[PDB]
Structure formats: C-alpha cells, structure tokens
Design a protein around this ligand. Structure first.
Ligand SMILES: Nc1ncnc2c1ncn2[C@@H]1O[C@H](COP(=O)(O)OP(=O)(O)OP(=O)(O)O)[C@@H](O)[C@H]1O
Ligand SMILES: [Mg+2]
Length: 261
C-alpha cells in the first residue's frame, strides 16, 4: 500500500526556488521563473518569460494573490540585477512595499497607490518603452535577438486589477501602454497582474489583461466560485489558498503557488 503524498498547502519560495541562478547567467536562464509546485510530481512549473513575457493571477478573496505576486517578484530579482530588471508597481491596497528591494524599483515614482500616481507613471513608462519598438529597417536575425536596444526589462507588477478598473472611471486604465503590448517581447516588457475572480472574466476581454490572456499568457486560476468564471476549460472551483489551476497553451495543471512571509 503506497504512502500518500499530496500537494502541500504551503510551499515557501525557498522550497520552490532553492538554487536560483544569478545575474551572471544568460537571458534565457534569468527569465525561466519558477511559479509553483506541480501536483503531479512536486516539481516546479515555470513561466518561460524569455518567450511568453506575462503572467496572470486570478483569485477570490484571500486566495493568495498578493503574496504570490510578492514571491514571484522575489524569484525574478534573485535572477536579475538592477541593470537587468526594473519594477513598476500598482499597489492600491498598499501590500507590496517589500515585494521588490528598493534597488530594483523603477525610479522615484515606482510604487503607485492611487489613480493619479498610476496615470502619470504609466504615461512616462510608455514614452520610454516606445523608444524600444523595433524598426522595420532591421533584419529578422536582429528581431528575436533584440539587438537594436540594450537595457533593463520592465516588470509591471499590478495588484488588484479590479480596483484599478473601478477607480479609473469609465476610461480604460493603462491606455498609453495597451498599444505596445503586442511588442512586449521585443521591448522587454512583462506584466504580472492579479485580479479578483468575480471580475476576472470581464478582465479577460479588456485591452490590458485581456490582451495578455488572449495571446496565451499563463494564467493561475486560484480559488473561486465556478459561476464567476464557468468555462469548463478552466476548472474554477474552491481551492485552498495558494492552490491554482495553471492554464497556458503549454498545458493545464494544478500547482501550489509559492508562499512568503
Ligand atoms: N502561496 C500561498 N500558499 C498558501 N497560503 C497562502 C499563499 N499566499 C497567501 N496565503 C495565505 O492566504 C491568506 C491571504 O493571502 P493574500 O492576502 O496574499 O491573498 P489575497 O488574494 O491578496 O487576499 P485579499 O482578498 O485580501 O487581496 C494569507 O493569510 C496567507 O497566509
Ligand atoms: Mg490582495
């Protein structure tokens, strides 16, 4: 009678990521980010952010959204120096002060806790990021190689998308950045967005989260009520905190996302 071992209800980031490679490594190694422990083998699943730049995290109340975003930002910072990565945060509920060490923050206005701050920061970011757009001049050998510009990748770490949408009036938030999203891989842009499950369905059809979702961004479906998001592809159901059905074009599987105090 074989011994039972199930997906543990709490896995620390150091258990998921005991041997992180460092800034010394190449781009591919620096952006192979562990995001959780698979139920099938207690082995890390990864965000291949060197190829698909984004990650979406959907979840009901107290399902672990903020902590997971914290933990994944840490795994990214373990792999990348402040010359290789910079973080801009949307943190309306003010829970991500320590998600990133102040060495890796994108300037003095990196942490935005309200609409006025975020609008200004997103304006400045889009102006800077558009400078990295690929010319039609160059050769496709330079396209995947991203050789026409050098600098840090930008991670847009966005907690509680539903609040940003609600506090934006009727205007779309991230309007300056949404047009650049098709070129995210070419300009080194990564968005990591959490959203309450009750609004995540509406979010999958907007121009920011929906652009990443419709283009195959890996998506954690944490605990939620099936009727908030009933599409049978994803198995939206009540889950322990941190447990998620991870969906990408690369497959669908149950993971335990990392915890961090
Ligand atoms: N990866 C995880 N694994 C297990 N438990 C977790 C994990 N992350 C968070 N938790 C637990 O779940 C609780 C809620 O965590 P957290 O605030 O991150 O979720 P949330 O979705 O941001 O909640 P809120 O609805 O307040 O925004 C915490 O008390 C924490 O102990
Ligand atoms: Mg939260």
């Amino acid at each position: 009678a074989p011994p039972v071992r199930v997906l543990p209800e709490r896995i620390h980031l150091h258990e998921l990521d005991p041997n992180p490679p460092g800034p010394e490594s190449d781009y591919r190694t620096r952006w192979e980010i562990p995001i959780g422990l698979r139920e099938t083998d207690l082995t890390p699943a990864h965000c291949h952010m060197h190829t698909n730049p984004h990650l979406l995290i959907f979840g009901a109340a107290k399902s672990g959204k903020t902590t997971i975003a914290h933990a994944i930002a840490r795994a990214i910072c373990a792999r990348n120096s402040p010359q290789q990565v910079r973080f801009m945060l949307a943190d309306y509920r003010s829970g991500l002060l320590d998600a990133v060490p102040d060495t890796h923050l994108l300037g003095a206005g990196a942490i935005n806790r309200n609409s006025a701050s975020l609008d200004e920061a997103v304006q400045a970011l889009a102006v800077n990021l558009k400078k990295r757009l690929p010319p039609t001049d160059l050769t496709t050998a330079q396209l995947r190689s991203r050789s026409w510009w050098s600098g840090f990748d930008v991670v847009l770490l966005v907690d509680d998308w539903h609040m940003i949408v609600g506090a934006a009036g009727g205007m779309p938030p991230m309007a300056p950045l949404a047009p650049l999203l098709p070129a995210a891989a070419d300009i080194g842009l990564h968005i990591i967005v959490t959203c309450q499950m009750s609004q995540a369905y509406k979010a999958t059809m907007d121009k920011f989260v929906g652009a990443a979702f419709g283009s195959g961004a890996p998506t954690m479906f944490l605990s939620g009520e099936k009727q908030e998001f009933p599409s049978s592809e994803f198995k939206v159901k009540r889950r322990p905190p941190g447990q998620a059905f991870l969906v990408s074009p690369d497959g669908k599987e149950v993971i335990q996302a990392p915890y961090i105090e």
